[PDB]
Amino acid sequence: MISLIAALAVDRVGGMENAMPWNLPADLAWFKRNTLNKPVIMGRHTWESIGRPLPGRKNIILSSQPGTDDRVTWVKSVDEAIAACGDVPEIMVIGGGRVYEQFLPKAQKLYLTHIDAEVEGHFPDYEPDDWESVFSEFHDADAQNSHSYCFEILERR
């Protein structure tokens, strides 16, 4: 099965630019916990932004061009990315926007972090009627985390 994992802020005319609006180590810990020992699929730009393989996961990068780093697995289509994962329980698609769009119709589960920051203007719109919330938990900002956030897991209805 295919899952998407992403961090989401509120869309708002007059909000911050999307360059770097939050700092959430707690969110990266949730990301790690829910991706470890699963294959992760990402687009080339997301790969270049992370800048190093995610340890303890099979890293699969989508690019139309040949690969340029032997530390990861390179694929040229969505179907090839899925086939590269083999027979596993859960494939994690980690971004970015173009990649989420292509995989959302295939996905059974969404792991979402709803961050209480307003940004003017990555994740596709999803029909709330087609998804059922199965886990959610709110957390206050703290000394290490700039904003409050809510983890949520949605499964197809």
Ligand X SMILES: NC(=O)c1ccc[n+]([C@@H]2O[C@H](COP(=O)([O-])OP(=O)(O)OC[C@H]3O[C@@H](n4cnc5c(N)ncnc54)[C@H](OP(=O)(O)O)[C@@H]3O)[C@@H](O)[C@H]2O)c1
d(CA 145, CA 133): 24
Find residue 8's DSSP bridge partners.
114
The contact pattern for ligand FOL, residues 7-26, with x = CB under 6 A and - = no contact, is: x-------------------
Length of the chain: 157
Rounded to a whole number of angstroms, the minimum distance from the CB of residue 52 to ligand FOL is 8
In the bound state with ligand X, the residue whose beta carbon lies nearer, of 80 and 142, is 80
Distances (CA, A) of 91 to 24, 30, 45: 24, 16, 19
Q: If binding is defined by CB under 6 A, does position 5 make contact with ligand FOL?
A: yes
Answer whether 103's CB lies under 8 Å from 81's CB: no
Contact range with ligand X by CB under 6 A, out of 22-30, 50-58, 74-82, 123-131: 74-82
Helix (H, G, I), strand (E, B) or coil at 143: coil
54 binds, among ligand FOL, ligand X, none (CB under 5 to 8 A by kind): ligand FOL
Rounded to a whole number of angstroms, the minimum distance from the CB of residue 50 to ligand X is 10
Q: If binding is defined by CB under 6 A, does position 43 make contact with ligand X?
A: yes
In the bound state with ligand FOL, the residue whose beta carbon lies nearer, of 28 and 134, is 28
Neighbours of 81 (CB within 10 A): 23
d(CA 56, CA 35): 9
Rounded to a whole number of angstroms, the minimum distance from the CB of residue 129 to ligand X is 26
